[PDB]
Design a protein around this ligand. Structure first.
Ligand SMILES: CCN1c2ccc(C(=O)c3cnn(C)c3O)cc2N(CC)S1(=O)=O
Ligand SMILES: CCN1c2ccc(C(=O)c3cnn(C)c3O)cc2N(CC)S1(=O)=O
Ligand SMILES: [Co+2]
Ligand SMILES: [Co+2]
Lengths: 371, 373
């Protein structure tokens, strides 16, 4: 629902690139604990002498972990003092990369690297880099007759962990959305960047038909491409009954940045059962949430399809409306600062993001403390 | 081979402190891939609001991984940019720390922090910080009637990983040696530091009585406390047939620093067998190494209890003596910078370091390139 742009097309998320302190051990964390697999590699052994990158894959989800190779790299070094580990760049796969770059320059988006083409044995890929909020960037990916595993300039993984094949699969298929926190009075700035320069559009869900700010302590504005596969909320703090997770994020980040990545699944019970086997840690949810959940469901128009005794067993959260529902869960922050975490979401005729769960978790904790 | 100090004593290694970018994941690496287990924790949940520190333990080895908690940490930040993830502090458990500190200051050592006392509901512990080569430091732990599980100010691990219990035990028990590489003509001064300032003495091994420098591309001086419970070789680069591994460390570390930590085991076959199952990667050793090892053994004095078909499969290296042999294997570095790796070593009447393996590995690589064409 919008107005189709003239030329060009944002297909989907390509990859999320982490600038981390140790790329080697960080890829091991996301493979062992979150269910990814080594896909490609670039570093000293392939011809890249300044930057090393471990590309890992699950379903269509592609993470690439990057670290600097030489000492005293200003950009990568600075970024680690400010943010620690965290998301550096979000990549889109596009048709007609040239026009999209020319469109955004016309409206006022700075171009970090204008279109250039790399080539190898499998084809040629166009790339171009635009910058968004904080130190985050967007690199556009245009495949011009490419049939390689990932991208040019990458070879096979430097080491195949023999532990990964003995581990259960996590049923993570694609990236649902990615959240970017902003300081106050920058949510409008950060979101309209995508509307103005990229010709995205404001996405509306059942989250926006109510005010959950007293429980959410945040204001959201979700921005999506025309085909609406790339959904991407933009947050900023707001007065609420508890300390703002958005303000504390911007505090520990030093600025704006990606708060969490949403990995979609179609078997969220198997997903969370197997993630907890591998050793990933999720947020605690008191029994009050599920006592209260069964009460609401009696009056509810919809019915939850999964075994609700397994949800309480696995600490998966639930949110619904008149038409459908969604099941979501959150990991403990994947680093030590209260900055970035991740989300596993399964949708059942529901396009929301679980904004009603802010109130739900609040009532769950409130009755637990009171009892 | 020494002269006893009047007072003051270093018991053994206490802990190794890595300053890493992501302590939460770094500790998860050493537990998953090295057989370590969570022991203690300090961070936001315990009171420490600037530096997080995950303390893990295997046998008597304890690694502590630390990260800055809020931005613009200059000490921890510049360390990460310059060294990457790396060893920041080698800690000794001591007796009579107060006397140890002044004698260090007399001979010219730098005291980074003069001694203090930490307190707990479990006793009191005394600490001090000395500066050594590079940005490496030494902290001393004198426990005064203290019975805490780790150290004062630390609490239970922040999260118990349930996959770790059902993973095979790696049978590692104590740190054997820690090596620190120096630039050129800086090895003697870095070893001199320990002799002059801590009353250390030069450790003498079967490796000292030969000249392997054309194969090692390094010169070595092992430094040890009197009781020789801690041994710390000190290396500088040296001209050799191949480029100096030591120089590549210094180039990639930005200066001096700990090259590799050595963990002693009494079942190196099961250790490497189980470590490989976990996912730890070691260096590549060709098949000719073991073709040549079998022929050299026919003419040696000693025999090896361990099956060689096992060593040839797990790629464990051997270096023997007139009356003993050691089994050693080295991991691929735990970063993408060719800096810090680790060694798993078992001893059999052999107080050497494997300095003959340089010539052995090179001979094995020379025959592999020779007769692969
Ligand atoms: C249950 C209360 N919580 C909740 C609910 C929904 C979302 C969420 O995924 C979301 C909400 N709006 N948009 C745009 C999103 O992507 C995040 C979080 N928490 C953060 C860890 S939470 O546990 O506090
Ligand atoms: C097999 C050839 N190699 C070898 C042999 C012995 C030592 C060693 O433990 C040692 C030798 N002297 N000192 C003081 C030490 O601690 C290190 C290394 N390599 C480095 C990974 S190696 O693969 O080149
Ligand atoms: Co979300
Ligand atoms: Co060694």
């Amino acid at each position: 629902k919008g107005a189709k742009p003239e030329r060009g097309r944002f297909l989907h998320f390509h990859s999320v690139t982490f600038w981390v302190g140790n790329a080697k051990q960080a890829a091991s964390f996301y493979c062992s604990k979150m269910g990814f697999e080594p896909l490609a590699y670039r570093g000293l052994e392939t011809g890249s002498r300044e930057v090393v990158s471990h590309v890992i894959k699950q379903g269509k989800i592609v993470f690439v972990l990057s670290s600097a190779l030489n000492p005293w790299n200003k950009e990568m070094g600075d970024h680690l003092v400010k943010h620690g580990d965290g998301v550096k760049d979000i990549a889109f796969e596009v048709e007609d990369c040239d026009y999209i770059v020319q469109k955004a320059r016309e409206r006022g988006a700075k171009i970090m690297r204008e279109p250039w083409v790399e080539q190898d044995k499998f084809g040629k890929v166009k790339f171009a880099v635009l910058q968004t909020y904080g130190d985050t960037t967007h690199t556009l990916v245009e495949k011009m007759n490419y049939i390689g595993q990932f991208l040019p300039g990458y070879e096979a993984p430097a080491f195949m962990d023999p532990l990964l094949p003995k581990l259960p699969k996590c049923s993570l298929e694609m990236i649902d959305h990615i959240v970017g926190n902003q300081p106050d009075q920058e949510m409008v700035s950060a979101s309209e960047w995508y509307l103005k320069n990229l010709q995205f559009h404001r996405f509306w869900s059942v989250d926006d038909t109510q005010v959950h700010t007293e429980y959410s302590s945040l204001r959201s504005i979700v921005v999506a491409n025309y085909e609406e596969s790339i959904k991407m909320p933009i947050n900023e703090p707001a007065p609420g009954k508890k300390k703002s997770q958005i303000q504390e994020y911007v505090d520990y980040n030093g600025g704006a940045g990606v708060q969490h990545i949403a990995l979609k699944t179609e078997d969220i019970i198997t997903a969370i059962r197997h993630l907890r086997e591998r050793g990933l840690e999720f947020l605690s949810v008191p029994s009050t949430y599920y006592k209260q959940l069964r009460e609401k469901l009696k009056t509810a128009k919809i019915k939850v399809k999964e075994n609700i005794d397994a949800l309480e067993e696995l600490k998966i959260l639930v949110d619904y409306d008149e038409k459908g529902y969604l099941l979501q869960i959150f990991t403990k922050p994947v680093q030590d600062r209260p900055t970035l975490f991740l989300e596993v979401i399964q949708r059942h005729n529901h396009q929301g993001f679980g904004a009603g769960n802010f109130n739900s978790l609040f009532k769950a904790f409130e009755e637990e403390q009171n009892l």
